[PDB]
Structure 1
Amino acid sequence: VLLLDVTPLSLGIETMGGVMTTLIAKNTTIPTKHSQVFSTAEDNQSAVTIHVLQGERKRAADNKSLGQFNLDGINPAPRGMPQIEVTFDIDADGILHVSAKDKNSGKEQKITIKASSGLNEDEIQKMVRDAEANAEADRKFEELVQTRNQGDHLLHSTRKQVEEAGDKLPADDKTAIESALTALETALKGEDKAAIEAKMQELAQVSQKLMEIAQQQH
């Protein structure tokens, strides 16, 4: 072949923390099809938003939005339990089909994005240059999002474990634990990574008895 039709930029979705998660890499030859399973981020969440992105930046807001749609009707479940399979499918014609399917109900929603959508050649080359220019700042953002996300998971799991512990947890530990939870919930709202790590560390240091109780319970 003298040519190849290729994706000039990565294609993906926005995920927890405001980051772009890539489903099809930059420079993939078409046709191609890739899927990844995602879940809900909150207890009893009934809908998830699929925001389709094109570009190479780590911050979703720094990429080109190709559109969005919601999958609703998700049944009541703890965060992290439902399985929403997201498929990016680019056919021979260069048309992008993005689908989200709830694996429990088999309910599906789709967006179709024609071959001419997204960034033009001038914008693609600016995108490529910016991603390279900003590699370092993008890495810092990605490390912060990972920290915040782990903090959020620890916040919620620890709250659940306090409840299941009930009376087994000494009153003094519950006091120490609840204060550190408030402090971490506050810190998660900012973008100071060190502060999140410090509240996470305070939690770990005061939760040792809770931890033993939770392990014992299962």
Structure 2
Amino acid sequence: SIEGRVKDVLLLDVTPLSLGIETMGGVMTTLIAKNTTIPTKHSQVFSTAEDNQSAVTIHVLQGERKRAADNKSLGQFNLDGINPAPRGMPQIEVTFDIDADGILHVSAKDKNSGKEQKITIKASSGLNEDEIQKMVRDAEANAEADRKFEELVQTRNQGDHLLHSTRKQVEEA
């Protein structure tokens, strides 16, 4: 109570903080949330708003929700190179089954040829609600640097199905 139930693993032996993807504009959307008891199995199909079958970013974000101090690392990778078919499809089904021991077996399965990548990434708890709000200071203020990446997003929000995703590493600098 007094609004502060970010962490809750006592009578919830579940996916322990809510964990999905860093989203459009320094936002966080969970993929599977607490109340889903391990071992879990659940499908959520996604697409992108730009470059559909060419790069999904698999930076899975374990944190809270809209105010992005929700940067518990559940990754930072990218499923790249799914043939040239950019912007909108929308057929990349992403299934996330966690095991009972605690590992997110999530396969971003693409519907171009089943170009998939199954990561097995940890999800251990052991932190605080002001690990998130303590990251509202250090890191909610660092989300202004993510505002530069919100220009890279193209600035929007929500992202139901659509979900911007592109890496950046040119040779010039």
CA contact (8 A) 1:32 1:89 kept: yes
Stretch of structure 1 that moved more, 95-104 or 7-16:
7-16
Q: 1:134 to 1:151 in 2, by over 3 A?
A: closer
Distance (whole Å) between structure 1 residues aligned to residue 169 and residue 136 of structure 2: 45
Pairwise CA RMSD of aligned residues?
7.8
- Displacement of 1:118 in angstroms is 7.0
- Displacement of 1:52 in angstroms is 0.6
**CA displacement 1:78-128 (0-9 Å, x = unmatched):** 411142222221112122212211112101112212353674698479789
Distance (whole Å) between structure 2 residues aligned to residue 9 and residue 138 of structure 1: 22
Stretch of structure 1 that moved more, 22-31 or 103-112:
22-31
Q: 1:5 to 1:132 in 2, by over 3 A?
A: farther
Stretch of structure 1 that moved more, 140-149 or 39-48:
140-149
Distance (whole Å) between structure 1 residues aligned to residue 138 and residue 171 of structure 2: 47
Structure 1 stretches lacking a partner, 5+ long: 165-218
Distance (whole Å) between structure 1 residues aligned to residue 45 and residue 148 of structure 2: 26
Identify which of 3, 7, 11 aligns with 1:3.
11
**CA displacement 1:3-53 (0-9 Å, x = unmatched):** 662233111112333322222112322111222111122257622211111
Stretch of structure 1 that moved more, 142-151 or 152-161:
152-161
Q: 1:54 to 1:44 in 2, by over 3 A?
A: closer
- Displacement of 1:133 in angstroms is 15
Please give the secondary structure, in 2, of the residue aligned with 1:128: helix
CA contact (8 A) 2:46 2:163 kept: no
Higher relative contact order (CA 8 A, sep 6+): 2
Please give the secondary structure, in 2, of the residue aligned with 1:122: helix
Please give the secondary structure, in 1, of the residue aligned with 2:112: coil
Please give the secondary structure, in 2, of the residue aligned with 1:9: coil
Please give the secondary structure, in 1, of the residue aligned with 2:58: strand
Distance (whole Å) between structure 2 residues aligned to residue 51 and residue 15 of structure 1: 9
**CA displacement 1:168-199 (0-9 Å, x = unmatched):** xxxxxxxxxxxxxxxxxxxxxxxxxxxxxxxx
Q: Percent identity?
A: 100
Distance (whole Å) between structure 2 residues aligned to residue 10 and residue 142 of structure 1: 23
More helix as a share of residues: 1
Q: 1:96 to 1:131 in 2, by over 3 A?
A: same
Distance (whole Å) between structure 2 residues aligned to residue 155 and residue 124 of structure 1: 23
Normalised by the length of structure 1, the TM-score is 0.50
CA contact (8 A) 1:82 1:104 kept: no
